[PDB]
Write a protein that binds this ligand. Structure first.
Ligand SMILES: NC(=O)c1ccc2c(c1)nc(NCCOCCCCNCc1ccc(OC(F)(F)F)c(Cl)c1)c1ccncc12
Length: 327
């Protein structure tokens, strides 16, 4: 059957931490006071929760409250433990409190507020310099969480908060985040369609931190080529075909042969035969100001089928693409 895989970095971080670190089920939640927070307005509703802008009346500061739906109320300890483990880390959203919502009777997570008043799609209107600057800021968060034995598993623009006025970035929504344990088989139903790595699409469960680096490459490709999303799958099956139309089918077949993966036979009639396209195929007069040989080389090194071949967050921070960014 499938060949095993393990991360090439931070492989054993959880084995050398005390069990209290990663055994989230044993964690005892310290509950705050729901009365400290006054809900102001609804910001959005997901499949398992709703988010509100709120005021912490003990300091008159804005906060964001995520109220869990009764269905998710049970599996909150994983997210809580990860948020507490990562608290204070570079560009990681701060969990300010955990309270029981008086209406839903479910857990409510209280987060640091980031000014989210930059309307439109700042995501598709940044300058070349600002793309590099913010990409480096995301990498500080990803190297931190990966160094802390945690995979985010939902890297996408909707989970990157930017206060453009103060050039502040936070990586949010650790609701799909997991502890990495070598040899552990994980659920492939993670990340959002357009940002799903090939490992998820071919049903390879023994993945690791490198899944976040594929998602990151999808964001970079979308920004530098002004193509939102870069890999525009109609469903999870077509998502792999869209990738194959860019990266080619040969490397895809080499990847599945290397890990002894059994490709879903539904792929036989839709994958076809494609050769790798050179990255300049995506360059045109409207995106040429964001494209550089450094950007293309960096992107090439993130968007690889083989999860063990992609740059790690630390290798990515060493890339020449970031030499122009003030440190
Ligand atoms: N943990 C929680 O559940 C959580 C924690 C905190 C918040 C939260 C959820 N949801 C909030 N609003 C609802 C979700 O609103 C998502 C808007 C995302 C906007 N991408 C902006 C953007 C712009 C440019 C980008 O490119 C780059 F290169 F990075 F520069 C990228 Cl990748 C992304 C919120 C608002 C204010 N302050 C804290 C929170």
């Amino acid at each position: 059957g499938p060949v095993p895989s393990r991360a090439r970095v931070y492989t054993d971080v959880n084995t050398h931490r005390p069990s209290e670190y990663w055994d989230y089920e044993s964690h005892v939640v310290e509950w705050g006071n729901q009365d400290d927070y006054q809900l102001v307005r609804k910001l959005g509703r997901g499949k398992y929760s709703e988010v509100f802008e709120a005021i912490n009346i003990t300091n008159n500061e804005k906060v964001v409250v995520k109220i869990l739906k009764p269905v998710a109320a049970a599996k909150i300890k994983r997210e809580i433990k990860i948020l507490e483990n990562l608290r204070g880390g570079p560009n990681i959203i701060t969990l300010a409190d955990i309270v029981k919502d008086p209406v839903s009777r479910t857990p409510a997570l209280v987060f640091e507020h980031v000014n989210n008043t930059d309307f439109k799609q700042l995501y598709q209107t940044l300058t070349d310099y600002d793309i590099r600057f913010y990409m480096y800021e995301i990498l500080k968060a990803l190297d931190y969480c990966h160094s802390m034995g945690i995979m985010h598993r939902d890297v996408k623009p909707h989970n990157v908060m930017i206060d453009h006025e103060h050039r502040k970035l936070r990586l949010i929504d650790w609701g799909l985040a997991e502890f990495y344990h070598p040899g552990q088989e994980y659920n492939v139903r993670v990340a959002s369609r357009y940002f799903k790595g090939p490992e998820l699409l071919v049903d390879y469960q023994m993945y690791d931190y490198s899944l976040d680096m594929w998602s990151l490459g999808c964001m970079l490709a979308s920004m530098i080529f002004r193509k939102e999303p870069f890999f525009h799958g109609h469903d999870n099956y077509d998502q792999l075909v869209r990738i194959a139309k860019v990266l080619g089918t040969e490397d895809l077949y080499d990847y599945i042969d290397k890990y002894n993966i059994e490709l879903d036979p539904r792929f036989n009639d839709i994958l076809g035969r494609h050769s790798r396209k050179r990255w300049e195929r995506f360059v045109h007069s409207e995106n040429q100001h964001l494209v550089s040989p450094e950007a293309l080389d960096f992107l090439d090194k993130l968007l690889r089928y083989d999860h063990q071949s992609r740059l790690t967050a630390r290798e990515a921070m060493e890339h020449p693409y970031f030499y122009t960014v003030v440190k």
